[PDB]
mmCIF file of N, CA and C in Angstrom:
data_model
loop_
_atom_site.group_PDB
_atom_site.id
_atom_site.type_symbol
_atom_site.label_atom_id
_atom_site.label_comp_id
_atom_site.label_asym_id
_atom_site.label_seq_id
_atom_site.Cartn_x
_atom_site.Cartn_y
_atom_site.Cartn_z
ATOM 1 N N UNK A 1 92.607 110.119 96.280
ATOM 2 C CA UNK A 1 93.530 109.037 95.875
ATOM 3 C C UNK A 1 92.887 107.674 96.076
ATOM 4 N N UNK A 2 92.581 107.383 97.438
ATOM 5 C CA UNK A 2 92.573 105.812 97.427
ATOM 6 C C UNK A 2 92.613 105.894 99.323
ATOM 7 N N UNK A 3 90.928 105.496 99.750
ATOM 8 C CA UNK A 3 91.462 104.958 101.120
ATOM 9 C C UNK A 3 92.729 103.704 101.301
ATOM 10 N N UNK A 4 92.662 102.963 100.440
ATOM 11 C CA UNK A 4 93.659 102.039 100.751
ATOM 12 C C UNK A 4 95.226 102.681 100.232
ATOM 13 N N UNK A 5 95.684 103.456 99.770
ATOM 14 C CA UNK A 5 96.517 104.050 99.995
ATOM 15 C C UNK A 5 97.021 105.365 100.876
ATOM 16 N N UNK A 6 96.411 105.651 101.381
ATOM 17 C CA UNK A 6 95.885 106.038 102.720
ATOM 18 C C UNK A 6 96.449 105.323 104.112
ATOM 19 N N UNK A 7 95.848 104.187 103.522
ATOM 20 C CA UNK A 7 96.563 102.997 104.470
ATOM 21 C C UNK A 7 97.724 102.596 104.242
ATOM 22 N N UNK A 8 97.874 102.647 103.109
ATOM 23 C CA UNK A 8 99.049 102.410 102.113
ATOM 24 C C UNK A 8 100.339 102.763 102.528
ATOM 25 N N UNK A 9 99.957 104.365 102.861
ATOM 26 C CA UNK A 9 101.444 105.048 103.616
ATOM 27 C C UNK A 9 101.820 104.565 104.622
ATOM 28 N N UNK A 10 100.041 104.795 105.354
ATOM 29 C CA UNK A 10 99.836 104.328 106.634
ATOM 30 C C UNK A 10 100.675 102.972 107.011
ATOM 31 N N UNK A 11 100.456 102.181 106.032
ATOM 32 C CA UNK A 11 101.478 100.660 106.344
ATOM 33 C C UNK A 11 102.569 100.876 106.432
ATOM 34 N N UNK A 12 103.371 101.399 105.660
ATOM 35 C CA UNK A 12 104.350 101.395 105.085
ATOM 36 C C UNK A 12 105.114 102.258 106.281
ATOM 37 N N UNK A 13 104.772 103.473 106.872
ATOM 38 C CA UNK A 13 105.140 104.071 107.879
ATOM 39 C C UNK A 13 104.730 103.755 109.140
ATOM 40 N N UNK A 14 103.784 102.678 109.369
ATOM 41 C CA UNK A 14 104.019 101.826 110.512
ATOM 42 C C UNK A 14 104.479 100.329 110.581
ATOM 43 N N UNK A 15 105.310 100.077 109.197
ATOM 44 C CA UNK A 15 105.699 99.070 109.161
ATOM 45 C C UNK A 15 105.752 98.088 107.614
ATOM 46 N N UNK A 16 106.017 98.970 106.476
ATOM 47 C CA UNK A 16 106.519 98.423 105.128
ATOM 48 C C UNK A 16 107.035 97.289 104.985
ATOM 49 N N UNK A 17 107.107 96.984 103.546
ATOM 50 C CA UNK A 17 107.694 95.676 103.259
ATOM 51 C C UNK A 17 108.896 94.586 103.685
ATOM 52 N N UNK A 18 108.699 94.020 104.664
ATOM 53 C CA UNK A 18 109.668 93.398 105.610
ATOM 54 C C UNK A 18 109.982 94.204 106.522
ATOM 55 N N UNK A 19 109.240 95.117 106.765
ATOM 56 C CA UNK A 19 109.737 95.939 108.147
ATOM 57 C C UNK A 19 108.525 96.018 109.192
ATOM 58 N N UNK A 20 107.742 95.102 108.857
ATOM 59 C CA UNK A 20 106.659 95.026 109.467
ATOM 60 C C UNK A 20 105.761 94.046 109.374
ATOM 61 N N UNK A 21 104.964 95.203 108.371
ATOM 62 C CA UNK A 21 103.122 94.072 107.609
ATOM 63 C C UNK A 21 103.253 93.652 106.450
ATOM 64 N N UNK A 22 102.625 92.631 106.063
ATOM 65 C CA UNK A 22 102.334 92.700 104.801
ATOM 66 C C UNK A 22 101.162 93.414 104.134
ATOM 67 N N UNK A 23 101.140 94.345 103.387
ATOM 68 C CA UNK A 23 100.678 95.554 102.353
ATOM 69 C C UNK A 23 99.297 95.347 102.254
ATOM 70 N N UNK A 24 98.702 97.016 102.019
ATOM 71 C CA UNK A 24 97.386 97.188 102.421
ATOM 72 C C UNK A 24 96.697 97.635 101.529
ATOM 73 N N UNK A 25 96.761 96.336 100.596
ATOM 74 C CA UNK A 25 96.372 97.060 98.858
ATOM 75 C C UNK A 25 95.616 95.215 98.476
#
């Protein structure tokens, strides 16, 4: 797929759009 989606989830499940980080793309 995509190391950065990878991270992608990875962000998103340690901390998604306003629930955390801003995005790892």
């Amino acid at each position: 797929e995509e190391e950065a989606v990878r991270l992608y989830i990875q962000w998103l499940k340690e901390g998604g759009p306003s629930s955390g980080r801003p995005p790892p793309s």
